[PDB]
Design a protein around this ligand. Structure first.
Ligand SMILES: COCC#Cc1[nH]cc(C(=O)N[C@@H](CC(N)=O)c2ccc(F)c(Cl)c2)c1-c1ccc(Cl)cc1F
Ligand SMILES: [Cl-]
Ligand SMILES: [Cl-]
Ligand SMILES: [Cl-]
Ligand SMILES: [Cl-]
Ligand code: NA
Ligand code: NA
Length: 303
């Protein structure tokens, strides 16, 4: 992890970056801020290129579509909690997801959005914004406090609240047993495994493949090729405070063997991987959770 670039929010007493994602445009990074702005920065120079007001509270998460035409944002407490924006021609609002505090695109064909409202998953059509499906079964729920619904790589399956759903049939296929209070789990890009906190399960048999203690209370992301997994531990759950602690870990995504532990000695707000297994960007807070304001920087690392 060679540092390449660092920058703070331009012309700001304290810097308020809260999240990041690589643009479809080379050399440009999208950043959310604590005042609900979306900014485009040159990641090498640190120059601010564009700014748009998206939310009336901190942006917590953002996801660009692969083709560069659409963007999902989420905010902490304002209404709507999540939104879809068009980024061709004039930056515009396409749809609002009033009470969904987390959203993702579908993965294979990016024609749908999946939103989370507490224990409930909502699936929407991008074109119409219509809610197509609600996935929720009170009898199967794990009631994970930090539930996030997600599609699998082929968009055929959803994981919501530790329940595996077949989308087409809107059938609960399997409920994974609950071994933590918070984390609901994600699909491995390999399409064969799910990672639910410290447990790795096989989708073809439902057997436990691996225990990975270091993944406790972690969010994870993969590099472009799905050969490396990055994890960072959430802080246990007024301005937005650092969602993560000060370390992230890398793992071989084929065998879950630890590769590196990186303590950046600053609490982490977000991490994003590029689309070419080359660069990582990290939002790091110079300030503590007791500071009046956050004072974040974006570091670009070569991996
Ligand atoms: C605390 O509430 C406000 C918040 C927040 C928040 N900011 C970034 C993320 C996040 O998960 N980012 C991914 C990457 C991504 N963009 O999905 C991430 C993967 C691995 C890493 F090592 C690192 Cl540091 C971050 C989150 C987040 C937290 C909790 C849950 Cl349940 C869901 C979330 F999206
Ligand atoms: Cl600038
Ligand atoms: Cl806020
Ligand atoms: Cl827990
Ligand atoms: Cl903080
Ligand atoms: Na730089
Ligand atoms: Na705002």
């Amino acid at each position: 992890f060679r540092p390449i670039s660092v920058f703070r929010e331009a012309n700001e007493d304290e810097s308020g970056f809260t999240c990041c994602a690589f643009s479809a445009r080379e050399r440009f990074l999208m950043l959310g801020t604590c005042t609900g702005q979306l900014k485009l920065y040159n990641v090498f120079s640190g120059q601010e290129e564009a700014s748009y007001n998206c939310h009336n509270s901190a942006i917590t998460h953002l996801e660009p579509s692969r083709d560069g035409s659409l963007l999902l944002t989420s905010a902490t407490w304002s209404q709507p909690l999540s939104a879809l924006w068009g980024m061709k021609s004039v930056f515009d609002m396409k749809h609002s997801f009033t009470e969904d505090h987390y959203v993702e695109f579908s993965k294979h064909s990016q024609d749908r959005v999946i939103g989370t409202k507490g224990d409930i998953a909502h699936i929407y059509d991008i074109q119409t914004g219509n809610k197509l499906l609600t996935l929720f079964n009170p009898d199967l729920a794990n009631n994970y406090k930090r539930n996030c619904a997600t599609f699998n790589p082929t968009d055929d399956l959803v994981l919501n609240d530790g329940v595996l759903w077949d989308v087409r049939s809107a059938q609960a296929i399997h409920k994974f047993d609950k071994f933590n209070m918070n984390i609901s789990g994600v699909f491995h890009p390999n399409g064969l495994e799910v990672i639910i906190n410290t447990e790795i399960w096989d989708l073809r048999t439902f057997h436990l493949l691996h225990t990975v203690p270091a993944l406790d209370q972690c969010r994870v992301v993969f590099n472009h090729t799905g050969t490396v997994m990055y994890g960072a531990m959430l802080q246990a759950d007024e301005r937005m405070k650092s969602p993560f602690g000060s370390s992230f870990r890398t793992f071989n995504a084929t065998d879950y063997k630890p590769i590196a532990t990186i303590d950046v000695k600053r609490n982490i707000f977000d991490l994003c991987t590029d689309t070419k297994d080359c660069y990582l960007a990290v939002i790091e807070n110079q300030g503590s959770m007791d500071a009046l304001n956050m004072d974040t920087v974006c570091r670009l690392y070569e991996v």
